[PDB]
């Protein structure tokens, strides 16, 4: 006779996110050739790692103006992708849709002052255990990097992702109050005649920024 099957009382509905390829209608249509086309990016975090975008600082600018005092602190921000300082970059705009990242966010600083004036800045990552640093002397201890301005102004830094969990959230849920990923800093450890000379900042992904569990959000 006919082949018997048992239609399961359950799991017959549309999951809305299930490898199912809907059945065929109006077939045998050969779309026009779209081969060898420029700017083709297979996946995201290949564009983010490669095309860095600016960060947002006070007054809606991408740069942090060098202050005239010899030792002062510049723009200090939480590390989580939802940080007002990254609210306008491609990296945060994309990591909005995903729930947890697992990678080193990469920062580019390039100096825009005249060749008249040199300046020497440092950036220091501070884990989430104790209050953030407030002076270069009290911040030299944590992971930091120092650099002088020169013919080449771009100085990258790879903000190390080190956390007690192999992944880490990208949306800081309202429950806690001091970000669990720790603060980064940017200090005027000394400058030359450059006062109000813009240091524009950039953000990017590192050699391993892996993103998983994509979710939705009203945005």
């Amino acid at each position: 006779g006919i082949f018997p099957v048992a239609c399961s009382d359950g799991y017959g509905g549309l999951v809305t996110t299930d490898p199912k390829t809907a059945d065929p209608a109006y077939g045998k249509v050969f779309n026009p050739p779209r081969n060898m086309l420029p700017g083709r990016f297979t996946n995201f975090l290949d564009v983010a790692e490669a095309c860095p975008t600016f960060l947002h600082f006070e007054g809606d600018v991408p740069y942090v103006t060098t202050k005239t005092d010899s030792d002062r602190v510049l723009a200090q921000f939480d590390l989580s992708l939802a940080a007002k300082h990254m609210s306008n970059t491609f990296l945060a705009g994309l990591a909005q849709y995903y729930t947890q990242y697992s990678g080193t966010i990469n920062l580019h600083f390039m100096f825009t002052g005249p060749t008249d004036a040199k300046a020497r800045y440092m950036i220091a990552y501070a884990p989430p255990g104790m209050e953030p640093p407030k002076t270069p002397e009290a911040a030299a201890h944590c992971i930091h990097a120092e650099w002088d301005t020169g013919l080449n102004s771009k100085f990258t830094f790879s903000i190390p992702y080190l956390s007690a969990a192999d992944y880490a959230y990208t949306a800081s849920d309202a429950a806690e109050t001091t970000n669990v990923q720790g603060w980064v800093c940017l200090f005027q450890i000394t400058h030359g005649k450059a006062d109000g000379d813009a240091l524009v900042v950039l953000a990017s992904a590192g050699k391993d920024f892996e993103l998983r569990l994509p979710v939705d959000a009203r945005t």
Partner: antibody
Amino acid sequence: QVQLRESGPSLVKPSQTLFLTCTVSGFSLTSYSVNWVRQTPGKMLECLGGIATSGSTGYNPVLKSRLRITKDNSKSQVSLSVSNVTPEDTATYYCAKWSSRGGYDCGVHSSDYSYLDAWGQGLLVTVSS
Amino acid sequence: AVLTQPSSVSASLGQRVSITCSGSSSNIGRYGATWYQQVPGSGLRTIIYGSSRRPSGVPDRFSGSKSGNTVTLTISSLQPEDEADYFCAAYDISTNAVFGSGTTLTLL
């Protein structure tokens, strides 16, 4: 000559936004930054913040999240904003100029080689319920 | 106001007046404080910047120096035009300046 004229509202009801301005006159705002410092009735000074020649600026950390400073680089006037005023925000409000391109934060209040040489006459902001 | 100031001091003309401004390790010493002046009814002027210097336009009789965690304003000669409130202000490690109470200096 350089002078700073400040125009703003007085007598306003608490819990309301405050729109202060410091018409700058005598020099280009691009060459000298302006800082805002207030003086409560009697004798005190609580630095509010300032705006550098460049867009980047800074504010008082204890008074941040209720301060926003814009800059009309052509009209040459700089503006303040206070999100929600309380009966204690009443003070004498000044605008001041640093001698260097960037003096946006409260760091300009104490500096080794930079000062605030030009001060506006100051407006008295009164709020009460 | 979050610094130590010596109330209001007085003296007569052509007398030396020294007003000390005592802070804390974080607020003063790391960076020299500044000294203002406010005539009753008029706005703030800057008298010492960098804790030890003068702004051009201010006469030479104002002299400040910084020691340890306290600074001091020394008026080498007093005049009738130097009667006003004197505030000391200094940048604190908290990123917010801490201001003195004002040393009203009255001439006799």
